[PDB]
C-alpha cells in the first residue's frame, strides 16, 4: 500500500498527491496529500463548489482548506481573492464537488488560468474538474495536473451528473532548492 493508495511508489524526495472530483451527489470530492486527506468526507470539510487545499511547498505544511459554492451566493469574487492571497512557493489543489460552474465568474477564471489552468475556461454546469497549481515555480511537465469531464446525457455516470475524475502524481521537493557550485 502506497501513500494516497498510488498505483506505483513515488520516487524519493517527492510529494504524493491524489485529486478526486465528486461523482454526482453521493460520491464526494477528495484531496489526498502525502497520505493525508486535506479535503473530503473523512475530514468533514468537502461541499458543493470548488474545494481548494493550499500547501506550503517549502515545508509541506497545509496552510488553508476552503470550499466556494458556485450554485448559491456570490463566491466567485471571494475565491479569486483567496487564490491571489496565497503566498509564493505554494501548491494549490482544486477539485469540484457536484457543481463548480453555475455562478463561476471571469475574475475567478482569470485567477485559475493565471496559475496554468487550460480547462477552467471550458467549465460548464456540473462539469467535474481537478487541478494542481504551483505559485512561484513551475511544475514538471510530465505529472498529471489537470482533467475536466463535461455533463453529457449519453455518457453521464449519474442521472444529471458526469463521472468523477482523478489525477495522481509525485512533485519533486527540490525545485527551488538553494544549490551549491
UniProtKB/Swiss-Prot annotation:
GG-type lectin domain span: 13-174
Disulphide connectivity of cysteines: 4-32, 10-170
Family from the record: Belongs to the FAM3 family.
GO cellular component: extracellular region; extracellular space; nuclear envelope lumen
Record GO terms (molecular function): carbohydrate binding; cytokine activity
Gene: Fam3b
Source taxon at top rank: Eukaryota
Originating organism: Mus musculus (Mouse)
Residue span relative to the full protein: 60 to 235 of 235
Tissues/organs with expression: Expressed at high levels in the pancreas and, to a lesser extent, in small intestine and prostate. Also detected in stomach, testis and fetal liver. In the pancreas, localized in the islets of Langerhans; in the testis, found primarily in the round spermatids; in the CNS, found in the Purkinje cell layer of the cerebellum and in nerve cell bodies of numerous brainstem nuclei.
Protein name per the record: Protein FAM3B
Amino acid at each position: 500500500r502506497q501513500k494516497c493508495d498510488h498505483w506505483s511508489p513515488c520516487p524519493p524526495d517527492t510529494y504524493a498527491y491524489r485529486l478526486l472530483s465528486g461523482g454526482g451527489r453521493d460520491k464526494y470530492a477528495k484531496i489526498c496529500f502525502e497520505d493525508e486527506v486535506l479535503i473530503g468526507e473523512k475530514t468533514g470539510n468537502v461541499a458543493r463548489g470548488i474545494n481548494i487545499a493550499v500547501v506550503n511547498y517549502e515545508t509541506g505544511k497545509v496552510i488553508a482548506t476552503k470550499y466556494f459554492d458556485m450554485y448559491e451566493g456570490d463566491n466567485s469574487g471571494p475565491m479569486a481573492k483567496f487564490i491571489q492571497s496565497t503566498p509564493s512557493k505554494s501548491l494549490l489543489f482544486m477539485v469540484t464537488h457536484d457543481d463548480g460552474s453555475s455562478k463561476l465568474k471571469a475574475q475567478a477564471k482569470d485567477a485559475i488560468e493565471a496559475l496554468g489552468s487550460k480547462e477552467i475556461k471550458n467549465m460548464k454546469f456540473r462539469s467535474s474538474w481537478v487541478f494542481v497549481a504551483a505559485k512561484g515555480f513551475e511544475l514538471p511537465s510530465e505529472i498529471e495536473r489537470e482533467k475536466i469531464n463535461h455533463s453529457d446525457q449519453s455518457r453521464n455516470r449519474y442521472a444529471g451528473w458526469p463521472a468523477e475524475i482523478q489525477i495522481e502524481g509525485c512533485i519533486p521537493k527540490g525545485l527551488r532548492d538553494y544549490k551549491d557550485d
